[PDB]
Design a protein around this ligand. Structure first.
Ligand code: Q34
Ligand code: ZN
Length: 147
């Protein structure tokens, strides 16, 4: 199905497909509630597309208020800030053998970060993607040992 046609009713369908629980990788993570087919559009990484140069001061502000800072790097110029206007996708942890991957899609001139399943994902599994200094806890055989 075409990419804009696939961005269909993600809000309703992701609410039934994924949930947030404690993760053995780190803190809380995103896990699936039902089997997700390979190639399936899982969830949008919801948030505000902001200028990359603004992230330092935004993270400094959040940190000074004891508010967890949730951001996803688009490119060297833009970042999605999911801190205030985010959804469950902000809890997706890194893995060196991920079952998901992140892509920047464009629908009706608007940029959205969407998470896709790389393989069939089975009920109970944690959803992970390769993030674009910090030790890694994915626990995979082929672990890069750093994020
Ligand atoms: N494979 C991994 N191995 C080790 N650590 C990993 C791995 N994948 C992700 N992480 C950590 O999660 C951070 C990204 N966050 C994902 C969701 C996080 N698990 C959370 O519970 O908030 C959102 C960040 C904002 N949130 C604030 C926060 C800080 C500390 C704690 Cl305990 C809970 C929340 C963290 C990333 O920067 C790493 O620090
Ligand atoms: Zn790893």
């Amino acid at each position: 199905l075409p990419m804009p046609m696939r961005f269909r009713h993600l809000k309703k369908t992701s609410k039934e497909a994924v949930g947030v629980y404690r993760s053995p990788i780190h803190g809380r993570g995103l896990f699936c509630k039902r089997n997700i087919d390979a190639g399936e559009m899982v969830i949008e990484y919801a948030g505000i597309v902001i200028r990359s140069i603004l992230t330092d001061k935004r993270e400094k502000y959040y940190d000074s208020k004891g508010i967890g800072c949730y951001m996803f790097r688009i490119d060297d110029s833009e970042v999605v800030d999911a801190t205030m206007h985010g959804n469950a996708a902000r809890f997706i942890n890194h893995s060196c053998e991920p079952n998901c991957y992140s892509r920047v899609i464009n629908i009706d001139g608007q940029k959205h970060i969407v998470i896709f399943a790389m393989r069939k994902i089975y009920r109970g599994e944690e959803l992970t993607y390769d993030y674009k200094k910090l030790p890694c806890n994915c626990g995979a055989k082929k672990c890069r040992k750093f994020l």
